[PDB]
Amino acid sequence: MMPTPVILLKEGTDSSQGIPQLVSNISACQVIAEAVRTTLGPRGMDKLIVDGRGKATISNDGATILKLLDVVHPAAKTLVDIAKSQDAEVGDGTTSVTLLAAEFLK
Amino acid sequence: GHRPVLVLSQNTKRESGRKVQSGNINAAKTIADIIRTCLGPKSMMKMLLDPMGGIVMTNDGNAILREIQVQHPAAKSMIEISRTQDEEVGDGTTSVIILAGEMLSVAEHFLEQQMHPTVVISAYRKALDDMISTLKKISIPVDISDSDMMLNIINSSITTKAISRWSSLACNIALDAVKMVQFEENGRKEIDIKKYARVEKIPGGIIEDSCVLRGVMINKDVTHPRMRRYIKNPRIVLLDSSLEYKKGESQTDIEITREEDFTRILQMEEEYIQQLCEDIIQLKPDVVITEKGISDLAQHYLMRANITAIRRVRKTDNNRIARACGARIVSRPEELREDDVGTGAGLLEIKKIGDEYFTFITDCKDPKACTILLRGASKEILSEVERNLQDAMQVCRNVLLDPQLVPGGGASEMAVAHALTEKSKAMTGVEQWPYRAVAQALEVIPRTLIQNCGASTIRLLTSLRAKHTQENCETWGVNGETGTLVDMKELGIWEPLAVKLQTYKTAVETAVLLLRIDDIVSGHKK
Amino acid sequence: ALHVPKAPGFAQMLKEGAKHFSGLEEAVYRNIQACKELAQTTRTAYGPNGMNKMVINHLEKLFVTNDAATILRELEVQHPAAKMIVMASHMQEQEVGDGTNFVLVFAGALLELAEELLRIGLSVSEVIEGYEIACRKAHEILPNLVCCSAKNLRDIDEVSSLLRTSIMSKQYGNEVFLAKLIAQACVSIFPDSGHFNVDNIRVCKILGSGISSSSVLHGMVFKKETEGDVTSVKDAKIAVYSCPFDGMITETKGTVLIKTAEELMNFSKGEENLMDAQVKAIADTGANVVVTGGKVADMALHYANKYNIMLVRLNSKWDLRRLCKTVGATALPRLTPPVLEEMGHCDSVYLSEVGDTQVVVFKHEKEDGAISTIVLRGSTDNLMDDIERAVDDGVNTFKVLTRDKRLVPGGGATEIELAKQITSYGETCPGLEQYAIKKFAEAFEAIPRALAENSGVKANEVISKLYAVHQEGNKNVGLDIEAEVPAVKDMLEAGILDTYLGKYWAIKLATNAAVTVLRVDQIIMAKPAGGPKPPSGK
Amino acid sequence: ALHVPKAPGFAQMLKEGAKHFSGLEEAVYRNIQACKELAQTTRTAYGPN
Amino acid sequence: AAVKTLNPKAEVARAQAALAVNISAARGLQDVLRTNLGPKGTMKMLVSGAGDIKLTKDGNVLLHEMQIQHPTASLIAKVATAQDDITGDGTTSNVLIIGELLKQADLYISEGLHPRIITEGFEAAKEKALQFLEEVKVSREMDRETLIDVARTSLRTKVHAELADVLTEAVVDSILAIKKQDEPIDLFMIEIMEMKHKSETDTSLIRGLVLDHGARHPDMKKRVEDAYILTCNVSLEYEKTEVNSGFFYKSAEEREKLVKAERKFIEDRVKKIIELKRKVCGDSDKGFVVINQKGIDPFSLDALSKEGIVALRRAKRRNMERLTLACGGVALNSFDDLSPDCLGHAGLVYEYTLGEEKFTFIEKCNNPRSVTLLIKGPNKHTLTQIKDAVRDGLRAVKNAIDDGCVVPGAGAVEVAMAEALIKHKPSVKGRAQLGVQAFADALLIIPKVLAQNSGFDLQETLVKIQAEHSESGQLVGVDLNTGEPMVAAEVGVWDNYCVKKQLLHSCTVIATNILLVDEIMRAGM
Amino acid sequence: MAAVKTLNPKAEVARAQAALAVNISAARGLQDVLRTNLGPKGTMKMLVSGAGDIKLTKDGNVLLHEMQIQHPTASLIAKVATAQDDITGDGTTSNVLIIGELLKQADLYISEGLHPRIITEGFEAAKEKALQFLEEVKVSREMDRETLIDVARTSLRTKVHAELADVLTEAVVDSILAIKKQDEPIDLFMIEIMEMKHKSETDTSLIRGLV
Numbered sequence A: 001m002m003p004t005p006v007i008l009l010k011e012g013t014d015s016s017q018g019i020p021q022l023v024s025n026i027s028a029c030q031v032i033a034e035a036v037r038t039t040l041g042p043r044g045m046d047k048l049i050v051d052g053r054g055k056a057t058i059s060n061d062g063a064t065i066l067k068l069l070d071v072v073h074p075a076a077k078t079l080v081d082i083a084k085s086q087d088a089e090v091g092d093g094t095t096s097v098t099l100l101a102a103e104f105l106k
Numbered sequence B: 001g002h003r004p005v006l007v008l009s010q011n012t013k014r015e016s017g018r019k020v021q022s023g024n025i026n027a028a029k030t031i032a033d034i035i036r037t038c039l040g041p042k043s044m045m046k047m048l049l050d051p052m053g054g055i056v057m058t059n060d061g062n063a064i065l066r067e068i069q070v071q072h073p074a075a076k077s078m079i080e081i082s083r084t085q086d087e088e089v090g091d092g093t094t095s096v097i098i099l100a101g102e103m104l105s106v107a108e109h110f111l112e113q114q115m116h117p118t119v120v121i122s123a124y125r126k127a128l129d130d131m132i133s134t135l136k137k138i139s140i141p142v143d144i145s146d147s148d149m150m151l152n153i154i155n156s157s158i159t160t161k162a163i164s165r166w167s168s169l170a171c172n173i174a175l176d177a178v179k180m181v182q183f184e185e186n187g188r189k190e191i192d193i194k195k196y197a198r199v200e201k202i203p204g205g206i207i208e209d210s211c212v213l214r215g216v217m218i219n220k221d222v223t224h225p226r227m228r229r230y231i232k233n234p235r236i237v238l239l240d241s242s243l244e245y246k247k248g249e250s251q252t253d254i255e256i257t258r259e260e261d262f263t264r265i266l267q268m269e270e271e272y273i274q275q276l277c278e279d280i281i282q283l284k285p286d287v288v289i290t291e292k293g294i295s296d297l298a299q300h301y302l303m304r305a306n307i308t309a310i311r312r313v314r315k316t317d318n319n320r321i322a323r324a325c326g327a328r329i330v331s332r333p334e335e336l337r338e339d340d341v342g343t344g345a346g347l348l349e350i351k352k353i354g355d356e357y358f359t360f361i362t363d364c365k366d367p368k369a370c371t372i373l374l375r376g377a378s379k380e381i382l383s384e385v386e387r388n389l390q391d392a393m394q395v396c397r398n399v400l401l402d403p404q405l406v407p408g409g410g411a412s413e414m415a416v417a418h419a420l421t422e423k424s425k426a427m428t429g430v431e432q433w434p435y436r437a438v439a440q441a442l443e444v445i446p447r448t449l450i451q452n453c454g455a456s457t458i459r460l461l462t463s464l465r466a467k468h469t470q471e472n473c474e475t476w477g478v479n480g481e482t483g484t485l486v487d488m489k490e491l492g493i494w495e496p497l498a499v500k501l502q503t504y505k506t507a508v509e510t511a512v513l514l515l516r517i518d519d520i521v522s523g524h525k526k
Numbered sequence C: 001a002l003h004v005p006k007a008p009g010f011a012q013m014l015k016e017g018a019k020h021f022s023g024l025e026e027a028v029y030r031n032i033q034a035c036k037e038l039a040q041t042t043r044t045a046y047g048p049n050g051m052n053k054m055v056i057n058h059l060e061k062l063f064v065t066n067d068a069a070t071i072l073r074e075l076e077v078q079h080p081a082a083k084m085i086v087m088a089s090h091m092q093e094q095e096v097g098d099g100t101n102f103v104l105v106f107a108g109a110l111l112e113l114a115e116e117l118l119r120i121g122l123s124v125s126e127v128i129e130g131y132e133i134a135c136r137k138a139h140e141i142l143p144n145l146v147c148c149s150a151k152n153l154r155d156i157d158e159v160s161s162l163l164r165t166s167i168m169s170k171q172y173g174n175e176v177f178l179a180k181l182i183a184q185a186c187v188s189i190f191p192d193s194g195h196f197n198v199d200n201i202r203v204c205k206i207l208g209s210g211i212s213s214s215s216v217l218h219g220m221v222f223k224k225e226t227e228g229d230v231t232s233v234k235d236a237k238i239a240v241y242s243c244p245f246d247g248m249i250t251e252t253k254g255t256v257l258i259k260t261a262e263e264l265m266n267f268s269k270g271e272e273n274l275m276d277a278q279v280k281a282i283a284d285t286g287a288n289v290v291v292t293g294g295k296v297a298d299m300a301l302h303y304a305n306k307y308n309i310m311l312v313r314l315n316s317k318w319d320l321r322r323l324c325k326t327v328g329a330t331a332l333p334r335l336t337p338p339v340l341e342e343m344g345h346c347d348s349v350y351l352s353e354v355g356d357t358q359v360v361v362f363k364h365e366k367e368d369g370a371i372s373t374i375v376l377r378g379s380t381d382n383l384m385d386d387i388e389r390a391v392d393d394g395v396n397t398f399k400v401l402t403r404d405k406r407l408v409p410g411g412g413a414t415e416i417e418l419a420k421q422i423t424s425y426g427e428t429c430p431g432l433e434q435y436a437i438k439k440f441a442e443a444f445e446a447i448p449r450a451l452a453e454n455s456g457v458k459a460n461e462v463i464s465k466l467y468a469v470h471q472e473g474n475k476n477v478g479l480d481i482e483a484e485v486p487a488v489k490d491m492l493e494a495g496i497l498d499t500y501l502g503k504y505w506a507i508k509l510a511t512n513a514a515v516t517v518l519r520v521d522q523i524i525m526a527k528p529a530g531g532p533k534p535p536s537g538k
Numbered sequence D: 001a002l003h004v005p006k007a008p009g010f011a012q013m014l015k016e017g018a019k020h021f022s023g024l025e026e027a028v029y030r031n032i033q034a035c036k037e038l039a040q041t042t043r044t045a046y047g048p049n
Numbered sequence E: 001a002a003v004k005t006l007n008p009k010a011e012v013a014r015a016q017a018a019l020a021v022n023i024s025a026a027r028g029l030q031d032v033l034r035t036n037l038g039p040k041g042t043m044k045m046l047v048s049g050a051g052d053i054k055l056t057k058d059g060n061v062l063l064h065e066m067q068i069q070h071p072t073a074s075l076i077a078k079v080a081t082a083q084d085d086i087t088g089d090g091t092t093s094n095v096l097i098i099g100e101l102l103k104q105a106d107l108y109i110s111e112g113l114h115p116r117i118i119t120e121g122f123e124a125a126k127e128k129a130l131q132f133l134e135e136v137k138v139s140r141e142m143d144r145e146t147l148i149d150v151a152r153t154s155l156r157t158k159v160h161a162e163l164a165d166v167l168t169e170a171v172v173d174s175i176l177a178i179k180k181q182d183e184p185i186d187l188f189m190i191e192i193m194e195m196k197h198k199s200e201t202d203t204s205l206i207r208g209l210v211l212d213h214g215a216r217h218p219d220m221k222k223r224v225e226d227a228y229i230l231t232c233n234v235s236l237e238y239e240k241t242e243v244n245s246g247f248f249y250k251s252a253e254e255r256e257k258l259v260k261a262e263r264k265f266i267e268d269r270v271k272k273i274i275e276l277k278r279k280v281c282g283d284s285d286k287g288f289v290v291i292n293q294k295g296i297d298p299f300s301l302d303a304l305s306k307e308g309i310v311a312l313r314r315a316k317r318r319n320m321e322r323l324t325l326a327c328g329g330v331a332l333n334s335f336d337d338l339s340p341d342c343l344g345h346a347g348l349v350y351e352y353t354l355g356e357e358k359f360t361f362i363e364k365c366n367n368p369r370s371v372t373l374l375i376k377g378p379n380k381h382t383l384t385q386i387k388d389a390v391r392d393g394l395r396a397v398k399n400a401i402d403d404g405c406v407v408p409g410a411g412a413v414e415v416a417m418a419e420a421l422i423k424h425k426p427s428v429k430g431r432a433q434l435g436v437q438a439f440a441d442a443l444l445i446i447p448k449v450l451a452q453n454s455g456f457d458l459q460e461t462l463v464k465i466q467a468e469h470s471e472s473g474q475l476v477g478v479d480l481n482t483g484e485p486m487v488a489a490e491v492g493v494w495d496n497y498c499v500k501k502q503l504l505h506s507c508t509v510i511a512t513n514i515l516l517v518d519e520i521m522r523a524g525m
Numbered sequence F: 001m002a003a004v005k006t007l008n009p010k011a012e013v014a015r016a017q018a019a020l021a022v023n024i025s026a027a028r029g030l031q032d033v034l035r036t037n038l039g040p041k042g043t044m045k046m047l048v049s050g051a052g053d054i055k056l057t058k059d060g061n062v063l064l065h066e067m068q069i070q071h072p073t074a075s076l077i078a079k080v081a082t083a084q085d086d087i088t089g090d091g092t093t094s095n096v097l098i099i100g101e102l103l104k105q106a107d108l109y110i111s112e113g114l115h116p117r118i119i120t121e122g123f124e125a126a127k128e129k130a131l132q133f134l135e136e137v138k139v140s141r142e143m144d145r146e147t148l149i150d151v152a153r154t155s156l157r158t159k160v161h162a163e164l165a166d167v168l169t170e171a172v173v174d175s176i177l178a179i180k181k182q183d184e185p186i187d188l189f190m191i192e193i194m195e196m197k198h199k200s201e202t203d204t205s206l207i208r209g210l211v
C-alpha cells in the first residue's frame, strides 16, 4: 500500500475481497441461523427481544425473531430477507429456510 | 463576595497633562506622514485593500485617509478634516493634512516651553487672518470666457494625478461637462455636478475613446424586441408611475354571484390598461421611459402606436434625462401636457457595448445634464480616472464661482510666510514666536515638493527664501519635476484662491481644535 | 537551516487547502495509476464468470450486482481522472445499454500502455496521435468483422437466441428462461412500425416465489387496491380521469352564501343529487371501470358502488399516462362521460393477490398492446433488483438490434481479431507512432485476458491459442468458458454474439476518455468543501 | 485580495520574534524619540530644586 | 511603519517591498500562464470544491479558476476580464506581456533607476508601437476564406485540431448567416444549445432554433412538416382577479355554473387562436406551432391539441426575438387583432427526446437571421470547453468583420514592433531609452513563449527569426512545427487588430500603474 | 506531491525551478542586507541579542552571524564567509555581494531557458581568465612602513571612524613591525589585545611590552 496523495475512493471506504470474505459471510450466516435454532419443533422454545423503548416481544416465529434482530451484516440480511419471503408466500417454515441455507453454506 | 466600590464605572481610562498633548500631536504627525509622499506631480500611488476584498489604487489623499481605520481620536479628527476639505472645494486634501501636521508639530515646541495653549491659539488665529489677507492680496483675476485659461487651470489641477498623460482630453471633458451642467432658474445660479454630471465606467477599450456626451447613457434595453432601437428625432415622455394594474389603497373586495362578472372584471382591467396607453399615445410621443414596471399588454398597446418603451429606470437617471432632453416627469398620464413632452434630444440609439445593451439619448440641443462615458483598462484604473475627473470638475466649478487665482508650487506658501514674518517683525509681545513659527511652518509645501522631486531640500529652500525676500518675486515657486526654482508666471501652475483659502483655514482650525484639548477620557458607553 | 520555504511565485499564492500537480510524474502518472486502480476494482466482475459485489452506499443500501455502471455509480469515486472514466462508462450505458465494463477495461489498459510508452521515451502528443490513428483503423476494420444479422425481430425463438448472450454475462446460471421472458415481452411491443420504445416494458417485482415463477403480462400491474366494492370486471370499459373523482369546485374561492332556511335545507341534498346524476351519466355509457388521478369523495364512491363501477386510483401521473397507452383511453380533464373514442377497453380488470401484495391487473388477451409488464418473483429484494437490471440489459440489446441488426462475435474473438489487424497495420506504418499503434492493438488483449482470469484458467495460454487460430484464418474463434483447461471454440455456431453498435460505441468512448485523460498536464484542485451538495443536484 | 504577503528576501527569512528597522523615519527618529523620552523622565530632578 | 502605530493589526509593504511583492505575483502568474499560449499549449485541469471538472487553456478561465488571493493577481485578473469582455481574446497574452513588462522594468530598477523614467519610456514605446501597428495592419475584404483563417487561428489554439476544423465552419457559417450588410453584429442572435448524447465532432449549425423544452401534451404531434409559427407572450392559464374577487353561490348548480364561467377569459383567447389556425390552414397538410413565453394550463393544452396544434410554453425571453428574426413572424403580447400576416413560417418542426429532456427543432426557415450552434459531447466538461472555444471563435470572427484590417500572427508583429522600437530608441531623449528597451524586450515574449511551448529553445529561434526579419523585411513569425521563420500572412495565421491594440493599451497602462505603486496597505479593520 | 513526500508525508521538498528560485531569493536577500556595509561610506548596524546586549558593527561576518536567519542557502553562504574570515580575515561583505550577483546574473539567463551547466562552464572559464589577469595586475613591491600604513588605513577606515582608524593604523603597523621576524611567519598570537573601559576611544595605543 502507498499513500497515493490523491486517493481514488472516498476516505474511510472499507473493502474486503477474496476467500476470507466469503468465509466471513458463511460464518455470519451461521451466526444468524444459531439465533433461531431452538424455536424449531414441538419441543421448541420462545425468544424474548427487547427494543430500545423497553417493549418486549416474545415469539416462536423465525421471521418475527429475525425482523426484531437489528442485523447489519450485508450477507446476513439475505437470510432475514428469505425468511420474510417464505412468510409472505407461504406463511410457515420461516425457520426451516434459514436453517437450510446456513447448512448449505456450512 | 464584597465587590469593590467605584465612583466611575470599570474600563474607564483617563489620561491627563503633557502626555495627552504629545499623543495628539504625534497622532497628527503620523497621519501626515502616511500621505506625505503623495503630494506633487512626482507623487507615487498607493494600493489600499478594502475589508470587503476590493483594491483601491489611488493617489488622492482623501481616499487613502478614508480607506484606513484608526483608534486614536486625533487621527479621527485628521480624517474628518480631510473629508471636509474634499467635500468643500474638491481637492487639496493632502496639502491640508500636511499643513495641519506641521502646525501641530511646531506648536508642540512652544507647549513644551511653559506656554499655555491659549496663547498659541491666539497667535494662530492672528496668523490665519493675515494669511487670508495676503492670499487675497496676491491673487490675480481670470476671465471665465477664455477657454484656454480654464483648460490651463484644470491641467495644473490634474498634473499631479495619473490622468496627466491624457491631460488635454481630461481637461476638455471636465470643462465641457461643467459648462453644460451650469444652469439658472428663478434668478438662482446652480452648478450641480453631483446629480447632473454622471460618470459611467465601462471596462475595456482605450481611455482615448472616453468622452462627454451631449445627453445621457443608461444600462437599459427595450422591453420588447419589436420596438425600434434607433430613432432620429424622438419625442420623449417621462413617467414615474406603473403602467400596470395595481390594487387600490383601501381594502377592496369583490363579491361575484353572476356568471359574467369574472370575465367582466378581467376585461375592465385590460380596458383600463388600454385607456392608460391611449392617454399616453394622445401626445404622440416616440419613446416612453418609466421608473416603474410596464405591463406586457401596455407594451403591446404602445408598439401598436410605434413607441419605444424603457421599463425600469432609476430616479436619478430619470431626472438626468429630464434635464438633458427638456422633458418633465409626470405621474398621471391623463394629466399629460404638451409642455411635458421632451423634445430636444437629437438621437436615441440603443447599441450593444461588449455583451450588454446601453441606451443613448445623445445629440441633445442645449442639454443641462451629461454622462461622462469612461472606457479603460479595468475597474480600478477607471475608478482612479473618475476620481481625477471629479477633482478637475470641482476645480472648474470653484474657478467659475470664484475667478481668482494664486501661484502654485509653493510660491503662495513662501510669499505668505515672508509677509507674515515681515508683519511679525513689528510685534513685541510673547505671541510673536508662535506667530513666526506657524509662518515658517507654512513652508512645508515647497519642502515636500522638493523631497518628492528628489532634489536637495535645504539649499533649494534657502535659495527660494532668498528669492522671496526680494520685491517682485511672489510668484516664484519650484518645479515639482526638475527640482529648480522657476517663476510660475512662466510655468503656468496656478490654483484657485478658494482652494488655498479653504486649505489654510482648515489646517489652522484643526491645529486650534487639537491644541485646545486635554484630559482624554475613554471607556464609557452611550 | 531546518525548514524548506515555499518557492516564490505561484507556490506562495496558492490557497491554504488547494493542491497543484504539474509535470509528467506528478500528474499524468498519478492519473494513470488512479484509472488503473478503478479498472482493477471493476475487472473481477467481467464476463459470465464475473463475481457479484456487495456495494453499500452512503445510505445503508445494498447493491449486489455485477453491472459495471451500477458498481461505479454506487462507488464514491473521488479521483477526477477516474471520474472522467466513470462518466465515459455512464455515457456508454446511456447510449447503448451494455459494454460499460468493456469501456472501463479498455480505458485502463490504454492508460497503462500509455504510461509505459511515456516511460520508454515517447511524448504525450505522439501517443495521443497513435491512439487516434489506431482507433480510426479499428473503426474501419470493425464492419468487416460482422458475422451475421438479426434478419428478423417479430420471431420469438430468434429474438430469444439473440438476447441470450447479452443476459448471459448477468445471471449466468439461468439465462434461457430470462431470454424467453424478455423476448416475449419485447415482441409484444415493437409493432409493425419500426419504432421501439424501451419505456414500454414495465417490471413489477413481487416477493416470494423464486425467479423461476416470473411471468409476462400483456397489460399493467399496480400494487394497490380498489376503492369500491367491485373487484372484478370481465369486459372492462375503463374511463380515465385526470381530475379527482369529486364534484368540481371554483379555482378562485368557494363560499356557500345562505340567506334563507330553504337554501340551508336544500344545499346538501342538491349537491348529492348532482353527484348521483354525474355518476349515473358516466355509468350510462357502459363504463364499468373508472380510473382517477386524484382523491375520491365519499358520496362519489357510494354512488359508484351503487351502479357497480370498479374504482382504481393512481397517484402517479406517469402510471396514468402508461395506463392510457395500455388501454387506449384518454385522460379526461373534467368529470364528463367519455365519448366512444375516449373510452378505453381492456379484456379483464380484477383484483388479485400475488404472493403477499394485493395487485390490480389490467390484463389483455391478445398478444399485443402498447405496454407489456414483466412480473418478477423471487426470494430477495436484491435478487429481483439484479434480475431487473438483467431485463434492462436485454431490452436495451433489443433496442440496439432494432437500430442496427449487425452482430460481431463475442467471447474475445472480435478483440483478438482487432488486435491482430491493428498490429499488422502498425507494423507497416513508419515513424514513432508505430509504438502507440501497437500498444493500442495490445490493449485489446485485456478483454480475453479478463475473461480467462474470471473463468479460472491461464490467460497467456488462451491468448496464444487465440492468436494461433486467428493466424490460421478463423476470425470467429474465442474463449470457451465451459472447460477446466485453456480451450477455444468457434462461437458463430455457439450463438455467442455482440451488437456491432455496442462495440463501436464502447471503443470510441474508451479511446476518447483515454486521450482526454492523457491530454491533461496540470492539476489545480480547490480545497474540498463540505457543502450539502451543489444546488444543481438539488 | 485581502492580505499583504511578506516581501521576498530578507523580510521572509527573518526569524519569528525578531524585529528589523531600517531607514531614517523608522530607526533614527525612533531612537531619538526614545532618548528624548528618557531625558524627559530624568529632567525634573535637575539642580537644587 | 507609521500606520502600524495607529492600526496595530495592519499589514504594510513599503518602498522596494511593494515593488518586490507586485513583481513576484506577476511573475508567478506569468509562470502559470506560460504553458497556455499557442496551439501547442497544455490542457489544464480545474477541480472545484464540489468536485466539478473543467478542461480549459483559456487565460481568463484559468485566472478565474486558480486558488489565488493576491492583490496584484486580482488586478491582473480584472484587466484580463475586461479584455475578455470587450475583445474576447488575448487574455493569456495580456498576462504574459504584463509580467514580462514588470520583469524587464525591475531589471533596470534594481540597478538604482527610478520607475518614473521607466514609465516615460513605456509611454513613448507604446506610442511608437501603436503607430507601427497602424502601419503594419493588412486591410482586406472579409470573405469566407479570411474568416475561416481567423477562426482556425483561434479554435486550433483553443481545442483539438479536428474539433477546431469543425468549429471553424460552424462559427463562420453562423456569423455569415446572422450578419446584415453595414449593420453591427448582434451575437445574442446565435443561440448556443448544448446536448450530451453524441461525440464532440457532431457539433453543427442549425439554420433555425433549438428549444430545450417540448410539448407538454402527449397527444400533440411530434413532427410537423409545413408549420405556421405563432410567437406569443400571452398567458393561457387561469389568472386570479387582482382585487380579491372570490365567489358566492347558494347551490351546487350555481357552483357548477360559476366553475364553467370562470374559464371564459382564457377560453376566448384559445378560441381566437383556434379560429386563426382554421382560417390559415383549412386542411391537415399544413401545421400550426404556438410558442408562448408564459404558461399554458392543461385545459388550454387539451383544447389546442383537439385542433392538432403544437403548443410550447415558458419559452426564454430572447427566443421571442430569435424566432421573430428566424421564422419571420412577430411576437404578440395580446390577441386583440391577430391576422395571418403575424405568423412565421418554418419548413420543418420536430421534437427530439434525450433521457428526461425533450428538445424542439425549428429548421428549414426561409432566410433565418438567427441561428443556433448545437454543442454535442459525451461529457459536461467537453461541452464547457467547446462552449468556450466557440465563444472565442465568434468573438474573433466578429472582430475581423468589424474592421477590415487584420494583423499577421505567430508573433511576427511582435518581432517587427520590437525591431522598430529598437530603431526608434535613439530618438528618445533622457534615460527613457531604458524603458523603451524594456518595452521592446517585453513585447518579444510572445515568440519566446511560442518557441518554448513548441519544444525549441528561446534564444536560437528568436535570433533566427529576428535575423530573417532584418534581412528580408517581411513579417516572419514562429513555425511551431519546425521552429524556422515563416510568413504568417502566406500561411494564414491571423490576429485581430483590435485585440493587439487592446493588449498594448491595457498592458502598458496597468504596468505603468503597478510600477508607480510604492506602498500596499490593509488597514480597513 | 513528489517522491519524498510519498515516502515521508511530513517532508518539505523544492524541485526543479523551485529550488533554484529559493536559493536565488535567499542569496538576493542576503545581498540586499549586506549592500550597505561595503566601503568606508557604509552604515553602522546595531544588533541586539536576546539578553539585550548591544553590538555596533559593519563587518560582514559579524553581521551574518547576528542576523536572525534560518535559511539553508543563507547557512551555506555564512559558512563560506566564515572560512573567508578565518583564513584571510577580510572580504566577507565582498564575498556575499559577489555570490549574490553571480546567482542573479546566472538566473537572468537561466530564466531564458538556458541550462545552469553552461553557465557554470562559463563561470569556470571566466574564473581562470580573471585569475590570470589578477596575477598580471598585482603590484609587487618591498613593503616599508608607508605601504603597510596605507593598507591598514584602507581596512580600518572601512571599519571604524576616520580619526579612530588613523590612530589604529599607527597602532597596528607598529605592533606588526615590532613582532615581525625577518623571513619568518608572523605569529599573531604574540600580540595581546586587552580591553579597558576608562578612557575615550582615541586613547587606545600600543605598549612595547605586556599587560
Ligand SMILES: Nc1ncnc2c1ncn2[C@@H]1O[C@H](COP(=O)(O)OP(=O)(O)O)[C@@H](O)[C@H]1O
Binding pocket: B038, B039, B040, B041, B043, B060, B061, B091, B092, B093, B094, B095, B096, B156, B157, B159, B160, B407, B408, B409, B410, B449, B477, B478, B479, B480, B481, B493, B495
Ligand atoms: N508642475 C508643477 N510644479 C510644481 N508644483 C506643482 C506642479 N503641479 C502641481 N504642483 C503643486 O502640487 C500641489 C498639488 O498636489 P496634489 O497631489 O494635487 O495635492 P492636493 O491633493 O493637496 O492638491 C499644488 O499645491 C501645486 O502647487
Ligand SMILES: Nc1ncnc2c1ncn2[C@@H]1O[C@H](COP(=O)(O)OP(=O)(O)O)[C@@H](O)[C@H]1O
Binding pocket: C045, C046, C047, C048, C050, C067, C068, C098, C099, C100, C101, C102, C103, C165, C168, C169, C170, C409, C410, C411, C412, C451, C479, C480, C481, C496, C498
Ligand atoms: N457464453 C459466453 N462465453 C464466452 N464469453 C462470453 C459469453 N457470454 C458473454 N461473453 C463475453 O462477455 C462479455 C460481456 O461482459 P459483461 O459482463 O456483459 O460486460 P458489459 O456488461 O460491460 O458488456 C462480452 O464481450 C462477451 O464476449
Ligand SMILES: Nc1ncnc2c1ncn2[C@@H]1O[C@H](COP(=O)(O)OP(=O)(O)O)[C@@H](O)[C@H]1O
Binding pocket: E036, E037, E038, E039, E041, E058, E059, E089, E090, E091, E092, E093, E094, E153, E154, E156, E157, E408, E409, E410, E411, E450, E477, E478, E479, E480, E493, E495
Ligand atoms: N498555427 C499557428 N502557428 C503559429 N503561431 C500561432 C498559430 N496559431 C496561433 N498562433 C499564435 O499564438 C498565439 C496564441 O495565443 P492564445 O493561446 O490564443 O492566447 P489568447 O487566448 O490569450 O489569445 C497567437 O497570438 C498567435 O499569434
Ligand SMILES: [Mg+2]
Binding pocket: A092, A093
Ligand atoms: Mg411451522
Ligand SMILES: [Mg+2]
Binding pocket: B091, B092, B093, B157, B160
Ligand atoms: Mg490637488
Ligand SMILES: [Mg+2]
Binding pocket: C098, C099, C166, C169, C393
Ligand atoms: Mg454486458
Ligand SMILES: [Mg+2]
Binding pocket: E089, E090, E154, E157, E392
Ligand atoms: Mg486566443
Ligand SMILES: [Mg+2]
Binding pocket: F090, F091, F092, F155, F158
Ligand atoms: Mg573589509
